[PDB]
Design a protein around this ligand. Structure first.
Ligand SMILES: [C]C1=[C]C([C])=C2[C](C3=[C][C]=C(O[C]C4=[C]N([C][C]N5C(=O)C6=C([C]=[C]C(C(=O)[C]7C(=O)[C][C][C]=C7[O])=C6[C])N([C])C5=O)N=N4)[C]=[C]3)C3=C([C])[C]=C([C])N3[B](F)(F)N12
Ligand SMILES: [C]C1=[C]C([C])=C2[C](C3=[C][C]=C(O[C]C4=[C]N([C][C]N5C(=O)C6=C([C]=[C]C(C(=O)[C]7C(=O)[C][C][C]=C7[O])=C6[C])N([C])C5=O)N=N4)[C]=[C]3)C3=C([C])[C]=C([C])N3[B](F)(F)N12
Ligand SMILES: [Co+2]
Ligand SMILES: [Co+2]
Lengths: 381, 381
């Protein structure tokens, strides 16, 4: 049941911003590993004396990578005279974030009808302000409120090409990589306490709980009116013999933060073939594949949705499959994106729920916890 | 003239250590961009709760990438009980270095006969101590003294496989990339004042000035007994209409530091073909190529050393050529390795001076400054 209670008009996920120590090296690694093109830049070459920011795109997916320059380059500037293209940026905030958390997501950005109104309504409804609305070149309005930990929910609204002050990059420097990723499906946070996190975020957005159906976690999913902006949140479950990966996350991250980004592929088999080709030559590694037992049990579950060929393809790529009462979900998880066992990526493809495809079709793979335990003891039989 | 005045026995360059915010992403970028294999690791998976360190190798070239974990992971440890594999590592030092300089070289490591003696003799002769000698697993001794800025000269000595506590990496995770790079030829520092820098380093090493033959710099080269460890140092020249790139370096780096690493290739044409193939897909970019004028003038200079084919190959790859009275130097420069206009890489190949090849054969490309200015005004003719 969807009460459609959004307190302001939300459109879609707009971009994700990583705070880095060196934006160049992270962006180049991610571009090769995920098949994303260099699309826009804001840095010294565009007059930005404050931060280096590079945008990667694949389909509608936008990854922004930002790092601070020496504060000395901009020490004569004041906020009215800043050369930063993202005026919410702060040298001290960024260094504090990165020294505390390592490489991770600073901003989950969603497009809204009116960022100034979204900010005002959010703060009026309990949101903790992070950066007030600012109009960029009379063209774009950006505002930020706290989401969890040091992650912000960033509102972006356009009167009418990423942000003012960003330049499109030279097509020679812009190689058209594409492994099939097309958009951000959902963004997942880890918190110490799920209840208060849910109460806070649902409180200021009006996002509603999304319909679901011990593995170390409890979780719930907050969703916008059309359920296209999806924000799952996890908490740890303690004293389980096998230590909760949520707890491990919280310790290595120094607290709450973004756990993973799920990226929708238009063809998950092509995406995984292309990413796995590059795992050992600069790209991303994947979690260990489930045993052949798991795939020997997939016929009895989704044999009506995937052929015997497409299930064999799942086995060679290590893809997981789960199923709602409305659709089917193909998913796989990368190993952590950086030094710490914190942030990772999920690749997904959803099958079903056509009207366009409705949001969250197939769920989020909850059933794959117990099926993994089943396949583990069935493999040792 | 070589007085062979080394105050202790120096062997060869051993490794270069980068201090990073995220060692994983920098190492993966560098591996793909330069064709270096993942060789050894020291990180959480090997019991290191202090820093993540990944070693890349190509031939005898060793690049180490290190970043700190949360200090909270090791807060119960003391130096006698540390899990760091490089006991000179300090969380505060590393964060201070990276916040001050961005991505850059922390350690220039050379192998010596006896690291404890090299440290003692160096400090007795004016070297500023950075980390005292420590014996690792009764097997390797490591000690550090200040070189310039926050760069240290690291002494490594073996009684008898990188360092104790480092594990060889899984061959599956270890793809045998190789673009032909084989060793570190020299490592170049930028300082505000060349004289006092030279007096200091030559003072504690006994390194001698290496034989040479306004572009914004003055420079000199310090060399070990057999001139295989080579350490050029630059200072800016001020008031030149065109601002000194050394000065620009010092401003963006927040002072003195390592400017570039020159990596010897066994086949610079293959290396540049392979690196340029990857420039736009995660690798490294190269400085703008010299005009065809420069190459039209190369016949009259090195037409006795390179064929008309090999000179055409230089033109398509943008390779520069210079010549001593003893040998010939092929060289090219990358764009900066990270966000800041600070550190970059040079690829080189030396032709001549065979006895083995003697160090510094062909010089360091000083003549390529004036020849570049000549080719610029000759191209506009
Ligand atoms: C620590 C640990 C966890 C598990 C499962 C094991 C187990 C093992 C089994 C398979 C394996 O490789 C495959 C793999 C391992 N992961 C990593 C863990 N994970 C997930 O994070 C996961 C997930 C399903 C959905 C999602 C989401 O999207 C979420 C949510 O959940 C909340 C709601 C909203 C969202 O959006 C997420 C994050 N599912 C199935 C999962 O398994 N992902 N794929 C690696 C290890 C094991 C055996 C047999 C023996 C040992 C010693 N271990 B062992 F202790 F290492 N171990
Ligand atoms: C700032 C600036 C510098 C120069 C040369 C120019 C000029 C231009 C010409 C070519 C170009 O692309 C090619 C390129 C540009 N670099 C970057 C600068 N560099 C070097 O750092 C360089 C070097 C030779 C040897 C070495 C070493 O190893 C050293 C030492 O030196 C000290 C002793 C020991 C070592 O070991 C080093 C670092 N050589 C020839 C050099 O040129 N490297 N390759 C890019 C720009 C220009 C024109 C025609 C018009 C404009 C507006 N400009 B413009 F102002 F952008 N401009
Ligand atoms: Co998910
Ligand atoms: Co050089």
């Amino acid at each position: 049941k969807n009460p459609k209670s959004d307190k302001f008009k939300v459109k879609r996920f707009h971009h994700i911003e990583f705070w880095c120590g060196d934006a160049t090296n992270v962006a180049r690694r991610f571009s090769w590993g995920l098949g994303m093109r260099f699309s826009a830049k804001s840095d010294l070459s565009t007059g930005n004396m404050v931060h280096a920011s590079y945008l990667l795109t694949s389909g509608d997916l936008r990854f922004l990578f930002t790092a601070p320059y020496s504060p000395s380059l901009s020490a004569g500037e004041i906020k009215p005279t800043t050369t930063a293209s993202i005026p919410s940026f702060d040298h001290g905030s960024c260094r504090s974030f990165f020294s505390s958390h390592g490489l991770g997501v600073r901003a989950v950005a969603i497009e809204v009808e009116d960022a100034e109104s979204a900010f005002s309504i959010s703060v009026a409804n309990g949101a903790i302000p992070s950066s007030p609305p600012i109009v960029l070149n009379e063209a774009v309005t950006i505002a930020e409120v706290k989401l969890y930990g040091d992650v912000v929910l960033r509102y972006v609204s356009y009167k009418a090409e990423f942000l003012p002050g960003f330049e499109r990059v030279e097509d020679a420097s812009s190689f058209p990589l594409d492994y099939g990723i097309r958009r951000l499906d959902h963004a997942v946070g880890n918190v110490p306490e799920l209840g208060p996190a849910l109460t806070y975020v649902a409180g200021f957005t009006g996002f509603h709980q999304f319909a679901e159906f011990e593995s170390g976690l409890n979780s719930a999913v907050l969703a916008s009116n059309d359920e296209m902006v999806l924000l799952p949140i996890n908490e740890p479950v303690h004293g389980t013999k096998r230590k909760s990966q949520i707890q491990t996350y919280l310790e290595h991250n120094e607290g709450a933060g973004l756990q993973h980004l799920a990226l929708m592929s238009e063809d998950i088999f092509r995406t995984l073939r292309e990413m796995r080709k590059r795992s050992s030559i600069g790209g991303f590694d994947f979690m260990p594949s489930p045993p052949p037992t798991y795939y020997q049990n997939l016929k009895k579950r989704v044999g009506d949705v995937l052929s015997d060929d497409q299930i064999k393809e799942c086995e060679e790529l290590g893809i997981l499959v789960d199923r709602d009462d409305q659709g089917t979900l193909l998913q796989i998880f990368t190993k952590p994106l950086g030094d710490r066992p914190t942030i990772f990526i999920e690749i997904i493809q959803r099958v079903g729920c056509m009207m366009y495809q409705s949001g969250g079709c197939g769920g989020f793979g909850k059933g794959n916890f117990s099926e993994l335990f089943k396949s583990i003891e069935e493999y040792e039989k």
